[PDB]
């Protein structure tokens, strides 16, 4: 039963390496774990920092475009206010334009009627001048006729006075001449009566 | 048995001590994994965290970059509209000034029209008066003429009247003279016959 | 006495008869005178008849002309009255015409002013109408926007629930493979240890038996 | 009778004086009449020359009144013609004016109608203005609400997008973790099987060394024993050779 004891001794001689190798065994068991895990973690940190450096850039650009948006918003607000004011002023101006045009139209009509009245007055003046000239000529003609009629009246008067004086003087001369004839009648009477009485007696003594 | 049991106990204790002296090293390796995996597990979490944050920033960036373009378009058309509104505004102000000028000239022209109308009223009044006096004088001359003609007619009747009066007075005066002379002759012959018969009585 | 009174009475008788004779002779003389100044008037009768004839014609015409002076006087007053009535009617109608003309002037003025006010009102109404129409267009385009907004929202919700579903399934697969690998390693180590605790004796004693068989088979036989 | 006689004588003388005065006056009268009887031929002339002047002045005044009356009649003829002309002119003017008034009243009625029509259209438009202001106010409200709706919708879309992207990121993360744990299990299994195989070759090499050693010693002892057996066989054969040699010697050594 000594050969099995020798088997135990050989088992010990085999255990020698089983304890000896433990160092490099556990070292190699650790190196693979460290390698794989450190590779994974390293690549993780790589991608993480890449994403971070992207996020910084994104936030920067975002702040920039926000600033631009605020500027353009203020400018736009002022512009739209100015446009509203402009539209209000346009409304007021169009109202004033309509009112002014109304006043102008009324004035133009009220002036055109005056022009018409002026022209009518001008025609009236013309025809009054004509009618006045005609009346003047008629006045001259009738004046001439009146003057001539008075001339003929005066001539008639002169003729009448002439004939009157003629008849008067004729009557006067007739009466005067008859008186003288009476004078010679008495003279010739006394000288004539006996010159015929004796003429009758001388022949009366005969027969 | 003195070397047997010594070798048996030595081998049993040797293997049962060395195997379990490596077992604890293996468990320490397990702990090393228990830390490594933890750190990897938290880094793997922050990675998704910053990924989410970056997605958020990109979304907001696109949002602002769009609502900025919208405002660019709106403000552009508003600028155009404002240019047009100010242009037409100046046009209207000028037009209103012109209309006011036209109104002033129109009024201050119809005033002078009123003056000319007044002058022409004067002219028409004077002409009407003059024509009236002309017609009056015409009528006066007509009346005077027909008066002269009537008086001419009456004188023409008198001219033939005094003629007949003359003839009548001449007839009467000659008849009276003849009566005187005839009476004288009759007296003559009366004394003639008287003395003739007287002497006839011897 | 006796003689004187008889003488004087004879004188008185003589004087009386003298008065009588003188008055008679004077009456005779006056008779001749009044005969003369009558036989004369009958001789001047002719000029008297002529004069009276001419006067007769004179007033015969005078009455006619004086009748004309009446007729045309009446006619004159008649036409004067008619002219007065026409003057009144003319003054009234001309006053009414002047009034109508003034009313036409003021009326045209009010017309122009009124049309100005109406034109301004219509312009402002047209501006309000334009604003209203543009607002309606705005509402239309905002509806056309909300539609596509909700469509995109639902699509994105679907894609979201898809992504989260795939995430959950990925967690399932992860725990699955982790448990599998753990149990696989555990079973491998178990079979390792069982094989070793079997080879602990099962091959030791039998192999040393075969070795003794070879040694004894070779050393002697 | 004495004084009576004296008084009668005196009265007689008085009567005598009366009749004497009368005969004087009567003789004067007779002389005057006889004087007139001669101048009859001339007082007649004065008579007729007087009545002539009377009638002549009468005719003169008559002709004067005739002339004046004719003048005053012609004057009224002229006045009558004048007024009858002015009436004509006035009635012409009034005819024209009474036409113009009709036209004026016509255009007056028309223009007043037009003015009332305008004053109606103005109130119409002014009411439309208010009923439009209310409308556009309501539309402003509608747009104001719809803008808020669209804003909220866009916000929710942004959020859904964000959480979806986050889900996909975590998905890729877990995929990488999956592959990692795979490549870890591989190396772990490899490292365990390596140890187990080193122990197995430890056992098998022990078996081998023992086997070839304990067999090599036995085979070497066997071959050594064979060589010894052959050596002893050869030495015994050499003993037989020398024995046969000496026996042949003694056989040839045969003699007396």
Numbering used by the authors:
A (entry chain B): 45 to 251
B (entry chain A): 46 to 247
C (entry chain D): 31 to 251
D (entry chain C): 27 to 282
Pull text from the paper:
Nuclear lamins are IF proteins that play an essential role in maintaining the nuclear envelope structure. They have been implicated in diverse cellular processes, including mitosis, chromatin organization, DNA replication, and transcription. The lamin filaments make up the three-dimensional meshwork underlying the inner nuclear envelope.
We determined the crystal structure of an N-terminal half fragment of human lamin A/C (residues 1–300; referred to as ‘lamin 300 fragment’ in this study) at a resolution of 3.2 Å. The asymmetric unit consists of four protomers (chains A–D), which are bundled by an anti-parallel pair of parallel helical dimers (chain A:B and C:D). Linker L1 and an adjacent coil 1b segment (residues 70–84) showed the hendecad pattern, which induces the formation of an untwisted helical section. In the helical dimers, coil 1b consists of the 18 N-terminal heptad repeats (residues 79–204) forming a left-handed coiled-coil structure (~22 nm; one and a half super-helical turn) and the two C-terminal hendecad repeats (residues 204–222) forming an untwisted helical section. The hendecad repeat region in coil 1b is continuous to the N-terminal half of L12 (residues 223–230), unlike previous predictions proposing a flexible hinge conformation.
